Design a binder for this molecule. Structure first.
Ligand SMILES: Nc1nc2c(ncn2[C@@H]2O[C@H](COP(=O)(O)OP(=O)(O)OP(=O)(O)O)[C@@H](O)[C@H]2O)c(=O)[nH]1
Ligand SMILES: [Mg+2]
Ligand SMILES: [Mg+2]
Ligand SMILES: [Mg+2]
Ligand SMILES: [Mg+2]
Ligand SMILES: [Mg+2]
Ligand SMILES: [Mg+2]
Ligand SMILES: [Mg+2]
Ligand SMILES: [Mg+2]
Ligand SMILES: [Mg+2]
Ligand SMILES: [Mg+2]
Ligand SMILES: [Mg+2]
Ligand SMILES: [Mg+2]
Ligand SMILES: [Mg+2]
Ligand SMILES: [Mg+2]
Ligand SMILES: [Mg+2]
Ligand SMILES: [Mg+2]
Ligand SMILES: [Mg+2]
Ligand SMILES: [Mg+2]
Ligand SMILES: [Mg+2]
Ligand SMILES: [Mg+2]
Ligand SMILES: [Mg+2]
Ligand SMILES: [Mg+2]
Ligand SMILES: [Mg+2]
Ligand SMILES: [Mg+2]
Ligand SMILES: [Mg+2]
Ligand SMILES: [Mg+2]
Ligand SMILES: [Mg+2]
Ligand SMILES: [Mg+2]
Ligand SMILES: [Mg+2]
Ligand SMILES: [Mg+2]
Ligand SMILES: [Mg+2]
Ligand SMILES: [Mg+2]
Ligand SMILES: [Mg+2]
Ligand SMILES: [Mg+2]
Ligand SMILES: [Mg+2]
Ligand SMILES: [Mg+2]
Ligand SMILES: [Mg+2]
Ligand SMILES: [Mg+2]
Ligand SMILES: [Mg+2]
Ligand SMILES: [Mg+2]
Lengths: 117, 95, 148, 243, 19, 166, 190, 97
RNA sequence: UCUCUUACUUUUAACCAGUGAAAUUGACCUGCCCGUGAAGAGGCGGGCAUAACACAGCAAGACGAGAAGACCCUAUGGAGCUUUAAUUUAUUAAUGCAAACACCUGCAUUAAAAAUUUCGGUUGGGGCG
RNA sequence: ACUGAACUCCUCACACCCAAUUGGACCAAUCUAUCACCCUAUAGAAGAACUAAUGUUAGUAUAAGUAACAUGAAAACAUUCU
RNA sequence: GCUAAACCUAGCCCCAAACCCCACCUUACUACCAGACAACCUUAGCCAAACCAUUUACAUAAAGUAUAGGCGAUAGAAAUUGAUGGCGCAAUAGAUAUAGUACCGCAAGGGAAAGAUGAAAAACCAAGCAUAAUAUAGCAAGGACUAACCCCUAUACCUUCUGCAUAAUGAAUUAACUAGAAAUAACUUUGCAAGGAGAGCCAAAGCUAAGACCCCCGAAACCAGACGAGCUACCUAAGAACAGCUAAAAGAGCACACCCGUCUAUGUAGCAAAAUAGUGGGAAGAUUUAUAGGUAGAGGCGACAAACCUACCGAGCCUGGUGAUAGCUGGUUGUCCAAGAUAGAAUCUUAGUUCAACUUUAAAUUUGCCCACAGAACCCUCUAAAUCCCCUU
């Protein structure tokens, strides 16, 4: 009789409560006998770096100069990464400079994005 | 009748009045006597002569017909050869 | 508003209703009094009295041919082509006292009116005008503004 | 409040705005034009004026078309502008009697037709009116090509028209291969209906089909900005080198 | 015929009011 | 809502002349929004009306009604404030000149009846007001004696005039 | 009035939101009979006879009557000594103080309606002087009207405006009954 | 108690603002301007009642005829219902008949 | 059960304390008898009675509360049902004729099923006559 | 003989006692145009006037402080007992 | 002196102008598996015709004309012509809106209420009562009186009616809201005038403009489209329950649980919008019952009780047509004056209406009333009060 309350797994009979989740991403599948097979590759692996020797504390000294915000753009990235090589080889096949015709074949495909975060 | 038409908002005319009565511009309404074509074999010649006559109407009947017909039917009509042309105005009428 | 009944409730029967008795305007036999009324030609009367009055007041100039346009311009007659008017008819009224010599063109003319016009040395001709031409001649300026 | 435009102009405004704007001009004009269909279920008046016997006066007379309901099955066949008449009748043909809903349906026949241009046999549900029209046109191909959309009244008919017109425009060698003389004879016979292939492609397409066709025509995977910036930088360096 | 007029409940907000 | 009773304690009279009778002190106190019917409170107010502070407290201490305790607390507060702030020399030298109960702001509730029907309850609240006047309580109005009653009758007889004449 | 268009409207019981169902049955409840909660009797219900839509009060007096009214206004001003004829509205300066002082010296009213022949040719000095004033209003000859003449205590006219008004108002006398709207060409009407 | 206990804030009306000062100007535009413009052309308001007057039924009919196609759906439905009701009332109810 | 009712316990009840509705309500300073009258008076006429208020019972009256009487009549007000009431066969089922070469379509006829609508007035209340 | 009307006279003044219906003279308040400026005037308008519809909403009464409702006992408020 | 009173702006109305990260169709807001299934088809009815059955509306001018029409209620062209805010609302108003929220309903769906200080809060008035219960007698007042009462006079109001104090209706009371819309034709006042009017229209003093007359609430109903078989009727799938004793494979008996509801009492605004206590029928079956699904209103279902289909089924409920209609009932709000109660006829009509009669208003004119003789029938032997007519007055 309650329509304004959110539909959650805590409401409904046993089947409803078991079937509905809470947003947690799946980790594996179910086989005969309701046995859960967990796939390791489906478990997110936290790639935590080595923080030893790292000099960047969470906060920044207040005695730091203020600089204008310059959001990075495709043109700026091209100028700062590809333009020097293009100029050098023009003075002296874009794959050599860095262009990749297709995202297929890459572990990290930019579009459609196939990596987390 | 229809006092305000749904399409024009005007007053309408009851066409039965137009089909049955004649309005003289003076304000008189002329009519034919009822039953002037019915059972003439059993009616005496005097009765037939009375029925074959064109007849005026009461003041109240004239007012009713004026209400049921619009102003277009009360205009002055200069027909070519109107048999009722001479009857459209009153003469030597006191009050 | 009275007391109860239909009159106070504002629901009294239509006009012409006689309480169920066959109404007066329906028990009278239909007769063709107004059959073809919208197709009967109408001619505005123009008495010789009116014409002489106009000529005397100078609203109609007898030194030039007089026709429907001149009469309308002088305001001696009002033509309503939309109301089935087919023009102007000369009328014998005022024939005895009519003295102007004029060349007038009308649509209808009585024998006595023609006689008076001709006796006074004038000329009268009866000219037909179908409704479109009649409207144009009565009101030429609007027609000229139509651009046709 | 009040809409800026009358509601009945909203379809035209949508045509003017959006991908419908990018649709080709000839197709848009074909959609806009609304030539009245040939009378089928009513007898048209002989002239624009008639002397009414009641008062013996000349009165204007207009041909008011009878609304026709075309069931979806008709679009799969060739009904010669014929469809269901959904109306009412007076029992015993007297207005003082009861009024009853009446549906008049055409007599549909399954017939096989051969298209010379398409060189194919089509089995089509047809009406005797359509058969008479085909006989008058001297062939299914002639009937399809001559009949406009508003008289053909069949999506299948318009698709057949598009196919025939496309083959005529392309002079397709696929029409009777290994028989160039016969192919040329057919094309010459139906020469007068030839139109540019660009128009023939859009002939007989519904609004949604035209929208989909235009979307498929103008869908392009975005060009990587790498190429654009490389071209711009190369042009700039060329200008610097020249000057 | 049996005549029954169902009871009509007044809105709850009228009696739920608090200072 | 109105709160004039509280303000009544803020009136400051001009200094009295030496040849003027000493003005008895007046202390207005009240309690607002008592969970009690004003009709029931009226009986307690009438009971203690016109009595000395000590006698009113004595009666209220042994009356069983709930409002008795509330009125006793109000009277004790009135006595304390009269001594502290209104320059009343003696605690016992005060009498209840005015004591009334006023309607408070009530809440409406629903009472369920037998057949889907209902009634509108009222969570009744009442105010309570007291004026304490310094000095002994005024003597009760003695009943009029036969002598005074006959005197009034004779005065009525003497007041007679010849009505409706010159 | 003729310009008036009252934009007052009220929702009738048919236009008030809701009010479709019967609040309760005819009989057995012991309450008054009702057919909807939006009838005029109910709180929040419709308005039985309220203002309905934008209503126009437009009506035209005969142009002869309006011209006669203008004439009567002019005669009233002249007879009551509120009419002042001028050769021209040219001022020595555009200062509104000069105009106000001149009116006060000449004993004109607190409100002055100055009239010139045409809007375009009105002198710049008087334009500047009257643009900054509230009770001194400058209008073209075509803009003269009874309401403004009555509102303003004194009426100032120029000689060309006098001739213009005389011609326009006298034409209504001795004009025929129209054959068609005077905007259309006539033999002698500009 | 339906009477306010305090005087309402004073209402100051500028009798000589521009609107009041120039009110009525060009009302004689026709007679004083060779009848180039009719005074009704000075009326600013709804398109369907510019230089026109009528009862409620006539006004509703004119509104539907002139701007009915541009009206909102529910507003047009309300106008149709109002026209229906006004027709019934004016043609079937009243003291006089 | 009753002749024929009595005794007791509990609940209810009354009193004290807390909390606290409902229908109802023109205003009421709200008596009895007879007569009157819109044809059964607290209110009118003639008499009689008459300090003031509480509390507990009672049910003779306030034509008591309750449901705009379900009985009866009326309404050119409804609806349900039945027909051998009037009007129809739009719809199905058959046939016959066309159309096409059994089906489909059109036109008729017959049934089945239904659909719409009505059920006058006067009347010593209505009905019957 | 007298008493006895709103009949009549007397002094003064007079439009100032019939339902439905009809004619007329005024008019409260509101807004607008001009006035006015401790509450107004001349006009134009209109959601323009409520002792009554088992009227609607809200407040508070009457019935009524009435009908109804609630907490087994003692105690150290541990606990025990019925 | 308490309840309380007030308040001004939150907003809204009418016009003009202008065109407007992730999750989610599975049980929505659910990361992640073989589909195939796809939309189009006349509105009807209320209502009017006083029933109802054909029928009944959904710029200007021509014109409410031609035409249509149980030729009647009513419907109704075309040719042709030319085309910048508020004498709005201001918290019961204005949008329903502080919000489609709270709340109500299974669902469609229905649908509210209200807030007020100040520049800064970092500063006297409705009802109801109380003050202050009451004194013989009486529509609660009036005449009065020295005096409140005592004296004398006085049968609340509204509606309805022949007639109401009526023991006929409504009303506890205060506040707020709550109900006469308009054409024809006339009348009054202007303007112009044989012409008037800002095309059209009218005109034998007319034309143009203005002023001034036409209510509110209420049905059972009808139709269209949605929503409903979590209750109940029946059914489908796959489940569960039935102690003990007698008998023996039983629509068997006694009897629990369980189902039902025979009779009594209580209750009747109740504990309950159908209950409680006792009593009683069945209780291994045509039983009872949990879960999910199905049949939907021109219908379903029915061991027919016109049963049941979400508490009110002779046919559900919601929304819409819809402000349905009602000759019927009720209501219809400032002051004052004046005139004002009249025969009948017709009518599916006698609860109404139209015409007469009466009545009202304005205008023109001259006779109006009362009434002297004379006069108005025989049938019929006699045979009334009178009447009609009617100069004078
Ligand atoms: N009648 C009316 N005029 C409006 C309305 N809204 C705006 N106006 C007028 O629009 C004009 C300009 O309005 P402003 O707000 O001053 O300017 P703006 O924003 O450029 O105006 P718009 O282009 O109309 O949006 C003024 O004359 C306003 O009175 C409206 O709703 N009705
Ligand atoms: Mg009444
Ligand atoms: Mg009556
Ligand atoms: Mg319950
Ligand atoms: Mg209470
Ligand atoms: Mg509605
Ligand atoms: Mg209703
Ligand atoms: Mg509202
Ligand atoms: Mg108690
Ligand atoms: Mg008696
Ligand atoms: Mg008692
Ligand atoms: Mg009794
Ligand atoms: Mg009773
Ligand atoms: Mg009854
Ligand atoms: Mg009936
Ligand atoms: Mg006397
Ligand atoms: Mg005034
Ligand atoms: Mg009002
Ligand atoms: Mg009131
Ligand atoms: Mg009331
Ligand atoms: Mg109480
Ligand atoms: Mg009691
Ligand atoms: Mg008790
Ligand atoms: Mg009917
Ligand atoms: Mg009726
Ligand atoms: Mg046209
Ligand atoms: Mg509101
Ligand atoms: Mg008070
Ligand atoms: Mg009584
Ligand atoms: Mg009574
Ligand atoms: Mg009664
Ligand atoms: Mg009562
Ligand atoms: Mg089920
Ligand atoms: Mg067993
Ligand atoms: Mg058994
Ligand atoms: Mg049976
Ligand atoms: Mg039965
Ligand atoms: Mg139900
Ligand atoms: Mg009604
Ligand atoms: Mg009188
Ligand atoms: Mg009859």
């Amino acid at each position: 009789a309650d329509r304004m309350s959110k539909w959650t797994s805590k409401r409904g009979p046993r089947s409803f409560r078991g079937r509905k989740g809470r947003g947690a991403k799946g980790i594996g599948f179910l086989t005969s006998g309701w046995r859960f097979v967990q796939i390791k590759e489906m478990v997110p692996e936290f790639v935590v770096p080595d923080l030893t020797g790292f000099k960047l504390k969470p906060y920044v000294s207040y005695l730091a100069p203020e600089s204008e915000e310059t959001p990075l753009t495709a043109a700026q990235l091209f100028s700062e990464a590809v333009a020097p090589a293009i100029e050098k080889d023009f003075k002296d096949n874009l794959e050599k400079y860095g262009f990749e015709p297709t995202q297929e074949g890459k572990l990290f495909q930019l579009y459609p994005r196939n990596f987390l975060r | 009748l229809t006092y305000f038409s749904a399409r024009k908002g005007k007053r309408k005319t009851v066409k039965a009045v137009i089909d049955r009565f004649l309005r003289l511009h003076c304000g008189l309404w002329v009519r034919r006597k009822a039953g002037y074509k019915k059972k003439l074999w059993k009616k005496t010649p005097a009765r037939k002569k009375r029925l074959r006559e064109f007849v005026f109407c009461n003041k109240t009947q004239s007012k009713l017909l004026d209400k049921m017909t619009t102003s277009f039917w009360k205009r002055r009509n200069w027909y070519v050869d109107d048999p009722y042309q001479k009857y459209h105005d009153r003469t030597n009428l006191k009050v | 508003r009275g007391h109860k009944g239909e009159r106070q409730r504002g629901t009294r029967p239509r006009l012409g209703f006689e309480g169920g008795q066959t109404p007066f305007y329906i028990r009278i036999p239909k007769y063709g009094f107004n059959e073809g009324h919208s197709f009967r030609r109408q001619y505005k009367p123009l008495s010789l009295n009116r014409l002489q009055y106009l000529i005397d007041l100078g609203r109609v100039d007898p030194s030039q041919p007089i026709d429907l346009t001149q009469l309308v311009n002088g305001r001696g007659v009002t033509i309503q082509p939309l109301k089935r008017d087919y023009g102007v008819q000369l009328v014998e009224e005022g024939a005895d006292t009519f003295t102007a010599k004029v060349n007038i063109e009308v649509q209808l003319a009585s024998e006595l009116a023609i006689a008076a016009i001709e006796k006074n040395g004038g000329v009268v001709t009866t000219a037909f005008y179908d409704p479109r031409s009649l409207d144009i001649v009565c009101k030429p300026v609007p027609f000229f503004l139509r651009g046709q | 409040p009040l809409h800026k435009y009358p509601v009945w102009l909203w379809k035209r405004l949508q045509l003017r705005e959006g991908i419908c704007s990018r649709l080709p001009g000839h197709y848009l004009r074909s959609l806009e034009e609304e030539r009245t269909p040939t009378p089928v279920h009513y007898r048209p008046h002989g002239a624009k004026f008639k002397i009414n016997p009641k008062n013996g006066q000349r009165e204007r007379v207009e041909d008011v078309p009878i609304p026709i309901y075309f069931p979806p099955e008709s679009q799969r066949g060739l009904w010669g502008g014929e469809g269901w008449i959904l109306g009412q009748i007076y029992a015993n043909n007297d207005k003082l009697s009861k009024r009853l809903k009446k549906v008049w349906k055409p007599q549909l026949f399954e017939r096989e037709f051969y298209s010379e241009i398409l060189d194919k046999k089509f089995t089509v549900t047809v009406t005797m009116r359509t058969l008479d029209l085909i006989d008058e046109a001297y062939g299914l191909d002639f009937y399809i090509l001559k009949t406009p959309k508003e008289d053909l009244c069949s999506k299948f008919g318009m698709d057949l028209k598009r196919g025939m017109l496309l083959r005529l425009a392309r002079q397709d060698p696929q029409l009777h291969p290994e028989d160039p003389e016969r192919r040329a004879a057919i094309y010459d016979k139906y020469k007068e209906f030839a139109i540019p292939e660009e128009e023939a492609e859009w002939v007989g397409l519904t609004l949604e089909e035209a929208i989909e066709k235009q979307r498929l025509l103008e869908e392009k995977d975005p060009v990587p900005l790498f190429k654009i910036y490389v071209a711009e930088l190369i042009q700039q360096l060329q200008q610097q080198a020249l000057s | 015929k049996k005549r029954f007029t169902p009871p009509i409940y007044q809105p709850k907000f009228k009696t739920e009011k608090e200072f | 809502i109105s709160r004039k009773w509280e303000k009544k304690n803020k009136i400051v009279y001009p200094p009295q002349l030496p040849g003027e009778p000493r003005r008895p002190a007046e202390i207005y106190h009240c309690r607002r929004q008592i969970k009690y019917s004003k009709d029931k409170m009226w009986y307690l107010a009438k009971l203690i009306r016109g009595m000395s502070i000590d006698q009113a407290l004595a009666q209220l201490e042994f009356n069983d009604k709930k409002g008795a305790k509330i009125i006793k607390e109000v009277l004790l507060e009135a006595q304390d404030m009269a001594v502290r702030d209104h320059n009343v020399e003696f605690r016992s030298n005060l009498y209840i000149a005015e004591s009334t109960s006023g309607r408070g702001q009530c809440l409406k509730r629903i009472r369920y009846h037998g057949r889907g029907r209902f009634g509108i309850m009222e969570k009744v609240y009442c105010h309570y007001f007291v004026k304490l006047v310094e000095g002994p309580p005024p003597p009760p109005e003695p009943p009029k004696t036969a002598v005074a009653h006959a005197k009034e009758y004779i005065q009525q007889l003497r007041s007679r005039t010849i009505v409706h004449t010159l | 009035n003729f310009k008036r268009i009252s934009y007052a409207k009220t929702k009738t019981r048919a236009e008030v939101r809701g009010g479709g169902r019967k609040p309760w049955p005819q009989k057995g409840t012991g309450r008054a009979r009702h057919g909807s909660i939006r009838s005029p009797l109910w709180r929040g219900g419709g308005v039985a006879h309220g203002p309905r839509g934008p209503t126009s009060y437009y009506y035209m007096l005969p142009m002869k009557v309006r011209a006669l009214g203008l004439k009567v206004a002019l005669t009233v001003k002249l007879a009551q000594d509120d009419l002042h004829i001028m050769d021209s509205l040219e001022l020595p300066t555009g200062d509104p103080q000069y105009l106000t002082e001149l009116a006060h010296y000449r004993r004109w009213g607190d409100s002055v309606l100055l009239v010139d022949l045409t809007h375009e040719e009105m002198p710049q000095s008087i334009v500047e002087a009257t643009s900054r004033l509230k009770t001194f209003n400058l209008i073209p000859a075509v803009g003269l009207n009874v309401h403004s003449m009555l509102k303003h205590q004194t009426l100032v006219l120029t000689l060309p405006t006098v001739a213009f008004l005389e011609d326009k108002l006298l034409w209504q006398d001795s004009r025929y009954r129209p054959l068609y709207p005077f905007s259309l060409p006539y033999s002698d009407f500009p | 108690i339906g009477i306010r206990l305090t005087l309402p804030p004073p209402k100051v009306v500028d009798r000589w603002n521009e609107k009041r000062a120039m009110f009525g100007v060009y009302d004689n535009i026709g007679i004083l301007g060779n009848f180039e413009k009719h005074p009704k052309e000075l009326i600013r308001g709804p398109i369907w009642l510019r230089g026109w007057k009528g009862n409620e039924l006539q006004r509703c009919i004119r509104k539907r005829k002139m701007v009915g196609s541009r009206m909102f759906a529910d507003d047009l439905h309300n106008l149709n219902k109002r026209i229906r009701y006004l027709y019934k009332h004016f043609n079937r109810h009243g003291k006089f008949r």
